[PDB]
Design a protein around this ligand. Sequence first.
Ligand code: YYY
Ligand code: CA
Ligand code: CA
Ligand code: CA
Ligand code: CA
Length: 343
Amino acid sequence: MIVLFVDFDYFYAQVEEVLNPSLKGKPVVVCVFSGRFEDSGAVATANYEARKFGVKAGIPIVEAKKILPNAVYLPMRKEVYQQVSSRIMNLLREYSEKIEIASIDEAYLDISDKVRDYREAYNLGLEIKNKILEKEKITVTVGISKNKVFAKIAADMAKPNGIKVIDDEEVKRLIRELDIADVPGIGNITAEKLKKLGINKLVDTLSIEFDKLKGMIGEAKAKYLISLARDEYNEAIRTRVRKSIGRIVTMKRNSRNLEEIKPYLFRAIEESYYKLDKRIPKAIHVVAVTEDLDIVSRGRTFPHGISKETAYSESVKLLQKILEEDERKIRRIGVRFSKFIEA
DNA sequence: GGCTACAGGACTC
DNA sequence: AGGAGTCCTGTAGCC
Ligand SMILES: Nc1ccn([C@H]2C[C@H](O)[C@@H](COP(=O)(O)OP(=O)(O)O)O2)c(=O)n1
Ligand SMILES: [Ca+2]
Ligand SMILES: [Ca+2]
Ligand SMILES: [Ca+2]
Ligand SMILES: [Ca+2]
């Protein structure tokens, strides 16, 4: 198989530049303001000019401002970024029937039937980049390889505004040489667990006892890494269908008082139901983030769809369970709906 | 022994 | 010390 992966560069920040070209060449930081106090919140992303100085996704906005007090700080406008995303995805559909939209800024295309070899794949990648630049003035990075995982790795290597093929010989090189932390699905927690076992490369997973590997990282992750290391990985490129919709908000102060929390919970429900738009969930989960940043939840599945009135009443019962079973104060409160009726 | 539903761990964006 | 969404797993009831 020949897989072509597209990952949009500096996406939210790049969109803001397209809509305001005066931002060109300035550091730009897209922010998620929690509303708790002045500049409370985190960075969603930043462009190269800010990121090169350490302003990276997830850091507190106050910390970004200590590093770059004169950068341009913009509130996240996700609805804008989504609309631009959708248009770019529509452009990509023209290059393959076999296409997976993986996230707000990623797609995988199976181009096995559109091209013969990696040379033709590379050239199609150039054509795609040109098209997206022509139509939307957005730069992207293309990764091309034999499966989804190595196509994503290919793009990681070529970012930003790049294009890279990882041929069959380089897959073997990477199995030996790629830091296993840089494999998709391996975060800091798993990477450290693997270091405890002595595993630094994919190849290392082949010689460790399977039960040892599994005991530390679980069966699925073990089999995943081994299949990659064996160069025997397969994962379908296919239509992702949204399985859950939800909203969680930060409260102005921490609280374990039901009547103080209800209004935030009810706003989260209202916004969630708006986003559901015709989709009818059969399951509801209430999610709380405690003052110490632990996430706790309580959910329920019904044998029918959940009306908004039922969501209100059941959400309170689930929050009640959290308050009954946990003595801590709550900082963020929200809901997630799932198990949609197939309409 | 392996379904199911639920609560939490961990990852991606 | 944001916020959205997904997949896996330990546990316990049930067959
Ligand atoms: N922790 C994160 C990571 C990404 N995002 C959003 C903002 C990013 O522009 C897009 C795409 O993620 P990606 O990790 O590829 O980041 P960039 O494209 O480099 O900005 O998703 C976010 O809101 N929070
Ligand atoms: Ca990506
Ligand atoms: Ca990106
Ligand atoms: Ca990693
Ligand atoms: Ca059995």
